[PDB]
């Protein structure tokens, strides 16, 4: 017995911790609904702590910040979108808001000027100060805070489109680069709970190609497959994957989107 | 909005034996003694949280305090003092203090890897050995052994073992300690960071003084050290080549991720305090 920081489960192990496109409905009650209860217990505990720096220094409570990481096409979006639903259902602490980090990308026009279209989605591609000032604002307890939005349809940022956040008990932060760390203070440092949505690399390709092409209608997969090899396959290896260990919870998804394994950080 | 909250000594001061070169006794009651109270109130709160993953999984944990900064800035004594005050709580005694220096490779090793000029860098340490050790501590392992370093001998003391016996609180003093990488790291296991900061051109003076007063005042003491004038040349050059780098590239960048910062003035006094509330 030589100690690991994590605690790994399979679906059946984890499922037995219950209190009593198309989102698979089963996986909610088996994998997510339990996962939600975990976070509920930490939300109130993490409240006490922040309330203990306050009592030291001598006004609702502080936002709980949930990051959600993984490669593109793995299913961060829905994964997060779902937890927004279940967490809100607590009453004890409703008003979960969800913000995509994509809205913080530079507009393509900008990227063109800095020559970063081929490194689109990389950590260079974002507006980290704008991103943080925003996140910093939220958790401060700012009456409101505005965040931009992204168009996967139009392929860029929707100009003058504003997502408003109004002092939420809980915030969720879905993004490619999000669990990232650097010389500047970063948004990663502000999280109270991380999620990494993981899968196999050669496997994810198939999902992305499917994400594309379901959103020339033949052999344009060539194009799609090559944006993977050039942009999205890198960025996973160098920038995203290395953040996996620092996640609070990991969710390995099988070939057919099913979730078998769960490594959880207890320490 | 900024994530931090900055104080001066007077501001912070209004929130209220041993030895070591010479620990200023005033700064205890004004800067440290308050700082200790802060940590006490987080220790019990952070207990509650870890006790909430437990209650979830269906059945206390060591509090881990990191202490960062450049060499010669005064991590050692800074930490050494907090060990004293924190222990005085009863609610949670048995603070143990471990230096990260003991985890350096032995020189002999470094020689083989050609890393003597990069000594103190993150390459210089045994990160796995360091972590299995830290991971072992916080697991709640009945005991755990950690090696030790010789600033006198200039290397690791062979077969010298510092034992840690399930402490309520542990302190982790080291150059590289608030570091982050692709491997899971000891930084990720901290519950509270300290950065001891000062000016760069300034610290040089202190280091040169750290050297030349150790290799002197107790070094020419048992003699069993090769100039007491203009060997500062040598000392000043180990700064420019080894210790000044490593601060810039490896240590300084970790400053923002610290829970508390302690800017020390030219003459060791502590004027400013940036604290992470968020």
From Swiss-Prot, chain B:
GO molecular function, one term: ATP binding
GO biological process, any: coenzyme A biosynthetic process
EC number(s) given by UniProt: 2.7.1.33
Record CDD domains: PanK
Annotated compartments: Cytoplasm
Catalytic activity: (R)-pantothenate + ATP = (R)-4'-phosphopantothenate + ADP + H(+)
Keywords recorded for this protein, A-Z: ATP-binding, Coenzyme A biosynthesis, Cytoplasm, Kinase, Nucleotide-binding, Transferase
Keyword Cytoplasm assigned: yes
Pathway: Cofactor biosynthesis; coenzyme A biosynthesis; CoA from (R)-pantothenate: step 1/5
Binding of ATP, residues: 69-76
Enzyme type, top EC level: transferase
Keyword Cytoplasm in annotation: yes
GO cellular component: cytoplasm; plasma membrane
A Pfam family reported for this protein in Swiss-Prot or TrEMBL: PRK
Other remarks on this protein: Was identified as a high-confidence drug target.
HAMAP family named among the record's database cross-references: Pantothen_kinase_1 (MF_00215)
Family: Belongs to the prokaryotic pantothenate kinase family.
Protein name according to UniProt: Pantothenate kinase
Natural source organism: Mycobacterium tuberculosis (strain ATCC 25618 / H37Rv)
